[PDB]
């Protein structure tokens, strides 16, 4: 969630240039980024994002159940430009924007704005509406080009903020060795007995609900070996843009 | 018994995050901030048999409004423990010690 990367990374933007939500949110998907080629100073513009899926994916809700995706982004514009003010936003951009709410990644980073969990089926293109700065009002900004860069997710996270795994990706044996007992679980859910031989030591491999192992009794397996399919439909993105914070003359 | 998942900021956690009712209480499960905070009661901890879908959320009804709740009507006696499907590995659980 937008929240986990707040709440643990100072900055979203990695010195590899990779976006942090790509560290528990493993899958690749495309995004896309449209934006003006230039803007004057003190003007709005609309930053228009785009996190494309195909509609009839059913991911692994956290129960077990299957359910539609969640989109999520982050914004990272350059210093000084910032989330338009609401008197400065037209109502034909105000129903643009539905009624998300753009939230700052940290209160002194006005910069970097993130939004999600929104909904997939509606949310799929998101505005951002932002201000662009004036250079005679700010002794840092300039008329220049500028870097903005987005990160756009869809789906569940397979890693959690403390490490741990959850059911949105893939289960492997602990252990090489053969499948001696499938234990399928009242509730969902299945425990994997191996033995392995080859050290004489027995190990339990426990899977979750909303997985299918694609593994049998009496089957070898080796260390990491996928215990079940993948059943992660999402990913996670990344776009880049160039702005010109044009000078009104020439 | 009124649970308010999302502190007033960013805050995931139960609030409270175990309370303790009788048969005949209502649970509620009011989401602030941090949706979607459907919770699912798991078959692990549950005292009676009882089916965990009956006393647990589906994949249509999912609470990503800041507003809608969920009530989990209990009767049986015992200790019951649901959890933040969204957040099962972050740490926002709760749990119904009903007697
Ligand atoms: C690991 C600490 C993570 C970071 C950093 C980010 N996300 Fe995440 N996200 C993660 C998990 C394990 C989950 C699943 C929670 C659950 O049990 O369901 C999520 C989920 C989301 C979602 C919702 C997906 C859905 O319901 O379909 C979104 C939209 C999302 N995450 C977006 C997102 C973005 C843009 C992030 C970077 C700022 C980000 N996440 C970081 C784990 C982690
Ligand atoms: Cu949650």
Known sequence: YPIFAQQNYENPREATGRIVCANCHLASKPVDIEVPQAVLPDTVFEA??????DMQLKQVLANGKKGALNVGAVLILPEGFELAPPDRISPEMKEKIGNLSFQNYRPNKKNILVIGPVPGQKYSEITFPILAPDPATNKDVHFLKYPIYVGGNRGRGQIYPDGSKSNNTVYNATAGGIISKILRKEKGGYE???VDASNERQVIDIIPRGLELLVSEGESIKLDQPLTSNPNVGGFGQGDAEIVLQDPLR | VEVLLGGGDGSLAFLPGDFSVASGEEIVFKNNAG???????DEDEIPSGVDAAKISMSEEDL???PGETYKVTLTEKGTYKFYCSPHQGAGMVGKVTVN
Do not use: S
């Open chain 1, 48 to 53: 228009v994002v785009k996190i494309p899926y």
């Open chain 1, 192 to 194: 994997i007995t191996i």
């Open chain 2, 35 to 41: 949706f979607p905070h459907n919770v699912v009661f």
């Open chain 2, 63 to 65: 609470l990503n409004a």
